[PDB]
Amino acid sequence: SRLLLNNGAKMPILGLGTWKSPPGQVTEAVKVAIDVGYRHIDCAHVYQNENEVGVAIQEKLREQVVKREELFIVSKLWCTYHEKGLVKGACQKTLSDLKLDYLDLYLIHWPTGFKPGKEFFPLDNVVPSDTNILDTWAAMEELVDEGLVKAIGISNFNHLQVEMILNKPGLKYKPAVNQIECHPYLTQEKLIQYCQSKGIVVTAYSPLGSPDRPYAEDPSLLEDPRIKAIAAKHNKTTAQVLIRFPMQRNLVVIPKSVTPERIAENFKVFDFELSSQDMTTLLSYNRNWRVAALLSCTSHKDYPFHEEF
Ligand SMILES: NC(=O)c1ccc[n+]([C@@H]2O[C@H](COP(=O)([O-])OP(=O)(O)OC[C@H]3O[C@@H](n4cnc5c(N)ncnc54)[C@H](OP(=O)(O)O)[C@@H]3O)[C@@H](O)[C@H]2O)c1
């Protein structure tokens, strides 16, 4: 139920996402998640709720429901902190809000660096930084040497950007994970095949198609009749099928939910198996549709989505 990372740690295949989870609902959501059995929580500074996520974690550690070593906490470095001197500072802010002394995994959220400041998305659309991916990676590597994070990774990096880090002169720490958008409408067969051949674990975000995305005629995965049929045959819900889908592709999945019953439902995905036919069918539903396309950074020198994969 856990995947081995290149650093020797074991990462729980199922995690709870926290993007869009209200500050007044995520503490209770994480508390319930931990009781239900979740041991992996996906976080990020830009989500503006790590302090509240941290409240839930501390309560459970205090209750002794779990030990710190049983939990796998993940967070990400936002685009406005790509400078060499701003990385440790961003990581420490997150550690304070979460009320932890170390993170299990720290990811470079997006390959695009923005102008450092108060705005998460600085504008003039989007002011870039002259920093590059290799300089930021070297700063991430220092976080490991100082003991702030157990492992470092990337997110939304295309194969060429992943290659750039892998061929870095004096590369000390290899990216442990590449978190990307993945579901039946954006299968990512090529990037997943690429990352998995390099010992990099793939985490699939927006597994249900992110039905509550801020940007709202759009296609719905949870409402797809073809996927509802597969779910009925296994007597499961379409969400459990959509969550079981990446698991059988050897991917870590992090569905988001602030609803106790759905959080519990999303956990009941270990007692069934999708046939090889069900899998091939789900893969054929690919349309190359993205929920997160970073539209504002279309002309950024490091925009990841111009290459095929
Ligand atoms: N690295 C990145 O750039 C990046 C980008 C996007 C997301 N992520 C991470 O990936 C996580 C998951 O992706 P996501 O938030 O985009 O969305 P998602 O998990 O695809 O979908 C979340 C939505 O699905 C609903 N849902 C959850 N369980 C359901 C169920 N069993 N039945 C019906 N509906 C259900 C939730 O409603 P309720 O919450 O109301 O139950 C919420 O509206 C994020 O929270 C974040 O941690 C990372």
Ligand SMILES: O=C(O)Cc1c(Cl)cccc1Cl
């Ligand atoms: O970048 C993320 O993780 C989530 C995200 C944010 Cl914070 C804002 C707009 C779109 C998306 Cl996909």
